[PDB]
């Protein structure tokens, strides 16, 4: 538990997210556009992940603050 279930969800996310990979079958412009779209999408994913890192760090600091508060209650 808590080691394969999450692993399974991550695997499913990878499966649904990684689309069909096929390049040399098509015209160069179409594949170039698709690759640029995927690059921009993953770059936006990086931006979102970084914003999540900052936000969760701030909320961890707030959790420390609440820990100090509950310590002040005793």
């Amino acid at each position: 538990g808590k080691r394969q279930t999450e692993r399974e969800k991550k695997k499913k996310i990878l499966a649904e997210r990684r689309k069909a990979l096929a390049i040399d079958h098509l015209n160069e412009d179409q594949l170039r556009e698709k690759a640029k779209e995927l690059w921009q999408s993953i770059h936006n994913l990086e931006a979102e992940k970084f914003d999540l890192q900052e936000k969760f760090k701030q909320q961890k600091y707030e959790i420390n603050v609440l820990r100090n508060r509950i310590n002040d209650n005793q």
Binding site: Q58, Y61, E62, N64, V65, N68, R69, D72
Partner: protein, 160 residues
């Protein structure tokens, strides 16, 4: 603040009825129109309203910088109608928490007199001698060098 015109044009009849009743009770003849705040406090107390009496007395000792001693309509009427709780929205708890976090460069869970002093330097506010002790009373409700976001919120909640 100068919300005096805003106050007089903002009041609801729920309290304007009592205001006019007190206007009748106070002004009964031989009135200069200034309406002394001293009798105003007693009349409002008799009216059954429940403001804080001592704060208005200290204000009367302090407000009216011109030193008339009998405050004109604006300030004394504002203090009278302070029974109506028309505050400055009280801001937001999340906004103040974000502010305290921004000040929490030390990241210790509290902002001390030094960080507040630096903030005052940044805004350029006048040097006041109420400092330190104001943090000690408001922020240091436990007297331990620790002030959380609740003391910050209650320090200037609904300031107008």
């Amino acid at each position: 603040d100068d919300i005096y015109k805003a106050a007089v044009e903002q009041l609801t009849e729920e309290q304007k009825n009592e205001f006019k009743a007190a206007f009748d009770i106070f002004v009964l003849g031989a009135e200069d129109g200034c309406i002394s705040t001293k009798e105003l406090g007693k009349v409002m107390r008799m009216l059954g309203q429940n403001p804080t009496p001592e704060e208005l007395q200290e204000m009367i000792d302090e407000v009216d910088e011109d030193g008339s001693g009998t405050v004109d309509f604006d300030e004394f009427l504002v203090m009278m109608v302070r029974c109506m709780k028309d505050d400055s929205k009280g801001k937001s708890e999340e906004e103040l928490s974000d502010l305290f976090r921004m000040f929490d460069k030390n990241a210790d869970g509290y902002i001390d007199l030094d960080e507040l002093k630096m903030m005052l330097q940044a805004t350029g506010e006048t040097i006041t001698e109420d400092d330190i002790e104001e943090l000690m009373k408001d922020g240091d409700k436990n007297n331990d060098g620790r002030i959380d976001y609740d003391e910050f919120l209650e320090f200037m909640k609904g300031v107008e």
